[PDB]
Curated annotation (Swiss-Prot), chain A:
Compartment list: Cytoplasm
Catalysed reactions listed for this entry: N(2)-acetyl-L-ornithine + 2-oxoglutarate = N-acetyl-L-glutamate 5-semialdehyde + L-glutamate; N-succinyl-(2S,6S)-2,6-diaminopimelate + 2-oxoglutarate = (S)-2-succinylamino-6-oxoheptanedioate + L-glutamate
Enzyme class: transferase
Family to which this protein belongs: Belongs to the class-III pyridoxal-phosphate-dependent aminotransferase family. ArgD subfamily.
One Gene Ontology cellular component annotation held by this UniProt entry: cytoplasm
Listed name of the protein: Acetylornithine/succinyldiaminopimelate aminotransferase
Record: residues binding pyridoxal 5'-phosphate: G91, T92, F124, D209, E210, V211, Q212, T261
Quaternary context: Homodimer.
Residues modified as N6-(pyridoxal phosphate)lysine: K238
Remaining remarks: The reaction catalyzed by ACOAT is highly reversible. This enzyme may also transaminate ornithine.
Swiss-Prot record, chain B:
Enzyme Commission number, as recorded: 2.6.1.11, 2.6.1.17
Primary site of residence: cytoplasm
Leading EC class: transferase
Pathway: Amino-acid biosynthesis; L-arginine biosynthesis; N(2)-acetyl-L-ornithine from L-glutamate: step 4/4; Amino-acid biosynthesis; L-lysine biosynthesis via DAP pathway; LL-2,6-diaminopimelate from (S)-tetrahydrodipicolinate (succinylase route): step 2/3
Organism: Salmonella typhimurium (strain LT2 / SGSC1412 / ATCC 700720)
Molecular-function annotations in GO: identical protein binding; N2-acetyl-L-ornithine:2-oxoglutarate 5-aminotransferase activity; pyridoxal phosphate binding; succinyldiaminopimelate transaminase activity
Listed name of the protein: Acetylornithine/succinyldiaminopimelate aminotransferase
Length: 382, 378
């Protein structure tokens, strides 16, 4: 079921897209700690930001603001639909704030009875009681006592189902523009635009969970930019801090007033500022699309030799490769084989291989790592 | 606040104008070793050039070392690391619920909590928290949570049954006016949890990691919980948290540690190594009395405090009826006089400085606070 590392696989050092364990074994990192290390390990710019702010100021409480948080909030506001930003520590906390806000906005603006949240099967939004209940995997939300109520789940990419359950008592639609954990499934243009129109019609807020697909992952700063569909609330984490625990919730002044920056650990925000400055450049964003195709070509060549993939999908450097029916439920086996061959990869359910490397992964590492993965595949299929 | 801190060193802070402040707040009991402590900076820099992040699939050496340190020093046999106190509390409450579900009955769901409790701001944790004003207005709350008065043992006995999974308590309610549990109350909680096969959950996010002058407040009481949560002081400024429990309870979630950010755990390790020494822990009690003597002298001059309470360097000064509801007025006057302090509700002044705050800083900061009080009274 769950993917756990054995006692002889403990990473100790990371440099760029390469990782070494206790025994000195070298790995190519196509996993990024599950799309977290978007600029690789110990990136000189991020290390410098960490070290310099570390000599100056680490922590301020939420009653105080700080320069790093102000600078970062300004950068997020200037680059996105957002007019207000709220900083926390993790994607789960960002989602908690987003869901609470959508609930409270509806409560004060319209009615205390306007509480329905529409979410999707296979959705992942975190592991707190509230976020995991909004998540679309019953197995992970079962067994913790009474779940917070008024959450309705329908299939991802099923617009009609959404239309069918939504009403004047609906406060929010929560969606990942691309379901990362859920098989790397991208929203269709019709579906995502349909969600915007339905939210408009019912006076509900459209909440985009961009914890995984945000901060450069898709080759745009945020996935919503690719679609041209503007949410009411957006959450960001993982890539935001490039390894440092930080998250952000983005919304408009009108919605935020129901509760330009709030919170944000000075050290976290300085690091996230440095990461933002690198990721939000035309050149890096262009490179993400160049690098994606380098990966895809290798995956196509692997399928040509071994006949193992039915679909190659995702956006930018969030890559999903679905296994053929003859290899249904073998994703974990391919992952472990990869680790043996010195390449770190991911799953997205039992049938899907997932890749989420550094957005600046070198071409040399792409070729070497994918050659290692091709070797690993050969060991599994023989 | 009306000023923006840009730099800190030890227990002194500077804003954009270069104005120097004495820090008796510690970012709400977070910076337990002050600002930019050389040992914590060294740990941050050394791990920061080695490895920042692994997912929960992997362990890492900093997480393993910190886990071992917490296990050796406490009742804990297993540790789960997170980023915030809210997350640690989420994990604790989910665990108590899941343990009851699989080891007893899916209907064993009642959580007993206390009025004025603070456990975080997620939907679940704020619902277990005892402040309706903070849990109202976010739609249907996670159910089966019962609130009774803090320190009321009879109330707890009354609500507990075979359908109770947990009692959740802060050994000292920091936000709730700095109110300490009585020995009989805390001991009684242990006895009742034993009787009803419920888990005793100690929220030591604020009162833990040296705050009370013991590594954890439970050690002062001699009452061992089933689950304990730690944050704030744990990382001395770095976002990190821990949930501590036994092997028996942790087994309900399907080595000795799980999760933990390499960078976070390295810093937390350096912080643990300093706080968990006989000398630092002794000093917390010395420093407490240095603060308390100033507070007593302020009251002698200005007739302002009816009670001075708390433990170690968690200090509460309740305002007299004449100054009821005006804790914010003294907080702002404090800031004007160049000293950073806290409130614990509208009636209580709260102090939570670095556990190694220099005596010179205590005297200077408290003199500034005396002047601030003087300007308000005049
Ligand atoms: C006792 C207590 N529990 C939980 C929390 C919440 O922790 P955090 O703010 O780090 O999420 C705090 C603050 C606290 O004082």
């Amino acid at each position: 079921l769950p993917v756990y590392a054995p006692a002889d696989f403990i990473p100790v050092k990371g440099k760029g897209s390469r990782v070494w364990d206790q025994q000195g074994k070298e790995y190519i990192d196509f996993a990024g700690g599950i799309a977290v290390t978007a600029l690789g390990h110990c990136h000189p710019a991020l290390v410098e930001a960490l070290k310099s702010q570390g000599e100056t100021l680490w922590h301020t409480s939420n009653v105080f603001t700080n320069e790093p948080a102000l600078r970062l909030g300004r950068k997020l506001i200037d680059a996105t639909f957002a007019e207000r930003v709220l900083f926390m520590n993790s994607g789960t906390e960002a989602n908690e704030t987003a869901f609470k806000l959508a609930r409270h906005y509806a409560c004060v603006r319209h009615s205390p009875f306007k509480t329905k949240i529409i979410a999707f099967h296979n959705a992942f939004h975190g592991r707190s009681l509230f976020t995991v209940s909004v998540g679309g995997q019953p197995k992970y939300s079962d067994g913790f006592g009474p779940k917070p109520a008024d959450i309705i789940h329908v299939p991802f990419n099923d617009l009609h189902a959404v239309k069918a359950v939504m009403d004047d008592h609906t406060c929010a639609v929560v969606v990942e523009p691309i379901q990362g954990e859920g098989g790397v499934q991208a929203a269709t243009p019709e579906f995502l635009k349909g969600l915007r129109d339905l939210c408009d019609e019912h006076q509900a807020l459209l909440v985009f969970d961009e914890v995984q697909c945000g901060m450069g992952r898709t080759g745009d700063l945020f996935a919503y930019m690719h679609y041209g569909v503007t949410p009411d609330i957006l959450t960001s984490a993982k890539a935001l801090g490039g390894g440092f625990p930080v998250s952000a919730m983005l919304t408009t002044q009108e919605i935020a007033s129901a509760f330009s920056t709030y919170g944000g650990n000075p050290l976290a925000c300085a690091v996230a500022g440095a990461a933002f400055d690198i990721i939000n450049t035309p050149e890096v964003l262009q490179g993400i699309h160049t690098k994606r195709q380098q990966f895809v070509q290798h995956l196509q060549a692997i399928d040509e030799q071994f006949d193992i993939f039915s679909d190659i999908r995702g956006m930018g450097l969030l890559i999903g490769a679905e296994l053929k029916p003859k290899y249904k439920g073998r994703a974990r086996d391919f992952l472990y084989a990869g680790a043996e061959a010195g390449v770190m990869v991911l799953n997205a359910g039992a049938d899907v291989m997932r890749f989420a490397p550094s957005l600046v992964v070198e071409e040399a590492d792409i070729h070497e790592g994918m050659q290692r993965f091709a070797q690993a595949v050969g060991k599994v299929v023989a």
